[model samples]
Target chain A: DWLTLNVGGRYFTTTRSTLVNKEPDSMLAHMFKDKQDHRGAFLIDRSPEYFEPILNYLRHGQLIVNDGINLLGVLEEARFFGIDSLIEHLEVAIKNS
Target chain B: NADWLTLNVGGRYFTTTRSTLVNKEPDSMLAHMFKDKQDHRGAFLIDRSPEYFEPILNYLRHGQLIVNDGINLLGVLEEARFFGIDSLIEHLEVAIKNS
Candidate 1:
């Protein structure tokens, strides 16, 4: 099912499969779990900028952020949103410095 | 707290607030498009292509020109002009020249 997310104050759309199936037992999964029909959206208390990469990662299993988004921000968000797969690349980019 | 408006543009749904539409460009067509329709529901039905309209919302949201890869700058420019988002037209002009 298609769903809209109120990412902080911004608007975004995605699917239940993308959120739950892609990342099982994750924070985002927990939000949408067991909901049949709902009005409005599940508003997340976070920045849309950070959540942008998170959503795309869930959509396609790749962490692709825009040019303005910083590595550290996405890394922290990747950790916070419980996206385990994204950390390694960020780690390699940061080089564990 | 402003109402979070859902616009069904060309059958694709997009969610945003009145402030995002009104505050960013007070003179824009979208700023007054709803004065006529009022609403059929919590959503406003706008018959416009979503692809070109999507970037325009973010331009107002972030005050920058960020578009997806391989998106036609010209398409975005025409849509920007249609929406009466003059500021975005200027931004698209520079980008159009560069591209």
Candidate 2:
């Protein structure tokens, strides 16, 4: 049950459940919905630079960022991916930073 | 001064802490990257397949590797060697042998 995501110009591997379980109304859910035989990977036009945080958030249910990361960039990515909690969290972190 | 690492691996970005990378294998390439000041603002780039790095990074973080379906263990072994993760190389060798 591995899923491949062509995010920006890079490829990421993960599970279908990981993509759909987080936000039902997210682009990921709609992209994978009811497509039982979806072979190969799906393409996403967003910057791959910010997708790691998105995936990490979905996998761990939280976003953990250290001082070196770009908080605003991650927040923008979270907004595009429809991760409400992460966006909120990043907002707070941004204001404090 | 930042303890975090932002990797631009094959054009994709990944983030991890410096301690996770150097704690077990201080002599590895990751440690060398920072020691040599090759990392700027805790960011470095590696021109390799980014897909294989997740498990490698997870292993660095957790001391275990879980190879999911569609993942190429052999490829990861190559990367493990590149980073000089001897323990991971050994683990991957056994996994490869038994497979």
Candidate 3:
């Protein structure tokens, strides 16, 4: 089944498995661990601009982000979310570029 | 209003509702493409970069512009122009230099 998350009022739709299975060690995965009769979109109190890239990375296993977006912001969010895969991915991006 | 339209661009396929194309912008080239355009695969055919065209289709589907990294906004603007997406053309032009 699919799931929706409301991050800073920006709605993001994705598969349940993608968020949990992509990075099992991530905070995002742990938050969704329980089966609470998943109803409406889960509310996330954070900026969605950077979170979009994290979702994109989980969906495609890539670090592709929008041009106008800042890498530092995304990296910060990745660190907060405890997504090691993306934390390392963003680090390489920042160091190289 | 809910007719499904399949578009094959450069061998990449996309399926969207008819209203997403025509209802949003009735005067666009893509809106006109629905008529008398169908391949043996039962989908409309267009030979173009799916990379750029995908964003255009998404813009029609949702009012927001979804441009990812490694993709210059100008390239997306070019495809928007090709599809005669007048409203998007102006928005893209403005977003190009904002930041």
Candidate 4:
């Protein structure tokens, strides 16, 4: 079954790498701080919108798409993780677009 | 003609016809043409090696050539596949089937 967790005014999901890390609080916060230091404040806060989908995908093996959101953010995060299969599918989606 | 003419004069002997020299086709043309004399049946065999056929077909039909370097593997496999040369493809299939 696919689970779509709506958090912070965003929806997130994917078929691979389900958000199984129940202890993502420390990692997420640290990652958030790292993003701010490197990408600046706007990007740091805004990046969660991208990670939310990754979290969804990590938790469930399904991709959940919602209104008014670009899938590229989740895709970028997938690429950063060196998830070639996900990246390949995301590229196909981009090509279809 | 050139041989006869050269024989009559002090010129060097001219041998071998242009067609003979230029037109060279073995059982496998590309395999014979390239540095590797034998085709790997799609995987780039140089001589008389086992064939890997199935992988070559998959590569040709769906472009699903798998290797450590996906992009480069795709390119190499595409070229070999497009031309219907079974070099590496033949070898890969043989290994898989035997295993």
Largest DockQ belongs to which candidate?
Answer: 3
DockQ of each: 0.03, 0.02, 0.05, 0.01
- Runs in model 4 lying further than 4 Å from the true structure: A1-46, B1-99
Model 1 in CAPRI terms: which quality?
incorrect
Q: What is the lDDT of residue A34 in candidate 1?
A: 66
Predicted candidate 3 versus true structure: per-residue lDDT over A2-97, tens digit per residue? 555778776565567878888988789888866222447788888887776677567556676545668999998898888897888888889977
Deviation in Å, model 2, residue A27 alpha carbon: 1.9
Can you tell me which runs of candidate 2 are displaced by over 4 Å? A35-39, B1-99
User: What lDDT is reached at residue B63 by model 4?
Assistant: 43
TM-score of 1: 0.49
- Give the whole-model CA lDDT for all candidates, comma-separated: 0.71, 0.70, 0.74, 0.36
The TM-score measured for candidate 2 stands at 0.49
**Can you write out model 4's per-residue Cα lDDT over B31-91, one digit (the tens) per residue?**
2333311111222221110112233334433445444422223333333443345545564
Order the candidate numbers by DockQ, best to worst.
3, 1, 2, 4
A5-52: candidate 2 lDDT, tens digit per residue: 787766765666777887777666667765112435577878877787
Q: What docking grade does candidate 4 earn?
A: incorrect
Q: Which ten residues in a row have the lowest lDDT in candidate 2 chain A?
A: A32-41
Considering every candidate listed, which one attains the maximal lDDT? 3
Candidate with the greatest TM-score versus the true structure? 3
CAPRI class of candidate 3: incorrect
lDDT per residue (tens digit) for residues A1-97 in model 1:
6566776766566567777886786687888866221447666777876766666567546544434547888888788888777778778867843
